[PDB]
């Protein structure tokens, strides 16, 4: 396959986020939920070994998928939860690509912020896909897939 699993993955992702205005009465989570830190200062993160960087991410997509599920699990059978859900679909492609490359699953891990705002969960996803992931799709790659 491609280094475009990232691109069609990023594509598919605005499209769902966009749809969060079709949903009447969207309420900021009744419980703050952890998410894979939206930090834009990854110069030092670049120096670390080829696998490590990938291992930090696997750990960070696991926490994300874990975040989606927990906020979708403070919430009933709605429209948010319904959408906050094919998002889980998208997260899972990423998780499978990284687990496969790495030959293992890893634990939930890394620096976090908490969010009641559903929007910012739809966001750490797009943000991971744009940084940590991207700066580790550009160095040729042991493919990504």
């Amino acid at each position, epitope marked *: 396959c491609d280094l475009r699993v990232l691109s069609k993955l990023l594509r598919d992702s605005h499209v769902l986020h966009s749809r969060l205005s079709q949903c009447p009465e969207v309420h900021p989570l009744p419980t703050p939920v952890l998410l894979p830190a939206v930090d834009f200062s990854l110069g030092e993160w670049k120096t670390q070994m080829e696998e490590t960087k990938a291992q930090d991410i696997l750990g960070a997509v696991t926490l994300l998928l874990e975040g989606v599920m927990a906020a979708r699990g403070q919430l009933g059978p709605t429209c948010l939860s319904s959408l906050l859900g094919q998002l889980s679909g998208q997260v899972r492609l990423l998780l499978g690509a990284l687990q496969s490359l790495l030959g293992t*699953q890893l*634990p939930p891990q890394g620096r976090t912020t908490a969010h009641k705002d559903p929007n910012a969960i739809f966001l750490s996803f797009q943000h991971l896909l744009r940084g940590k992931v991207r700066f580790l799709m550009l160095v040729g790659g042991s493919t990504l897939c």
Partner: antibody
Amino acid sequence: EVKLEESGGGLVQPGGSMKLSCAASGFTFSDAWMDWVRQSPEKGLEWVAEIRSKVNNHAIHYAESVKGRFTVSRDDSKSSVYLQMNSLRAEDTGIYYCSGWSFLYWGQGTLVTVSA
Amino acid sequence: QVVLTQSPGIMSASPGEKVTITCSASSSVSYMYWFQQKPGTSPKLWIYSTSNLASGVPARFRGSGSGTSYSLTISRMEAEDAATYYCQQRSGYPRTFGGGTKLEIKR
């Protein structure tokens, strides 16, 4: 929160057959890779088998000392994983454990005695 | 068929003593993983990815090494630390473990 309960162990005679079950709760089971790991005073901890998730195509791997004899499977719908054991040898004796998410979660273990 | 070997097979120590256990690998591996096990209960993840402590694991522990040689150090150990520790590698299949270091206490 996340729990795994083996059942199905106890006595089986050499050359018998026995099926282990493992019930998961409290996380999305079809998202988990699962593994079977057995223990005895002599051999120590020995990995037996791994079965991957739906997204990881359900890839299977076996310990060499077990090929032809043990089969592993899962039922996502049922949140469960299994170890179908055949032509059991005395050396298969030991506590057997399901482990979930690549050795992050561990059941309580079941004791498998192969004797006549 | 990567073979793992753990040094002092057994050892004792006192609270406030530095402890250092070694895992040697038969060929090069990118990471080591560790597990702790106390009698009559199940192994638990202790250290993964060489140097990351597991949920539940105190800051007095540190994992390190690379290639062919790794280790688990406790800076100043505590009674609750007495157990068997196993290294495990994941560079392919089979998965193999080392045969344990029993860390017991002296009194």
